[PDB]
Amino acid sequence: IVNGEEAVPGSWPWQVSLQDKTGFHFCGGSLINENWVVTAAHCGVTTSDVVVAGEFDQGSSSEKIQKLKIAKVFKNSKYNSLTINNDITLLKLSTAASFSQTVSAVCLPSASDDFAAGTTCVTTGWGLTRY
Amino acid sequence: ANTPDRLQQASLPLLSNTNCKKYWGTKIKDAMICAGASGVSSCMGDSGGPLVCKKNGAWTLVGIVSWGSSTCSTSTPGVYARVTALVNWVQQTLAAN
């Protein structure tokens, strides 16, 4: 996030880091319950990648995190790799996340919800702060 | 060049489709929602993370970080997967698995 700010640690407890088997962060995602993460289809997640829950400082070797294996990847079959439309994938965890002060789920909307233009919303992540 | 160690956040406004299309034109499709162009930008490593808005006091997933300016410009709209258009697929997938 360019021109964002540091979050209060643990205050976005559904935010996960998607990492390869060496620990390299390549995408974010959101817990929607103890067994499932929602992320983007173009992230290309496989069952070799891992979901890291409870993280704040990826440079802190001593932070208490949950490194969760992925049992199955559910890419929306309508993801359009040309137009980027329908860019969503679900990850089913092989072991449930353990919810806590720093790990819990985001709510999902109903298909009919209207979120008005101009509403102040929030986005979070460990992406670049300068391109 | 490298990602921040510590989790970042930014507040930003949802944009109407009409205003988003003033920049991106016909690249904006029906399962996309735009936000930002407000001095902040999602960027490489943010993809797949959340865009949340309050609904009756509870943070609710409205977008999934998807794509945008290829230099992460803070004055152009960021584009997010529109969760309202995709949540029936989410619920069906959970129910079957």
Partner: peptide, 11 residues
């Protein structure tokens, strides 16, 4: 869901 145990602080 959607209610953090630690409240976010946003400028």
């Amino acid at each position: 869901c959607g209610v953090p145990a630690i409240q976010p602080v946003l400028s």
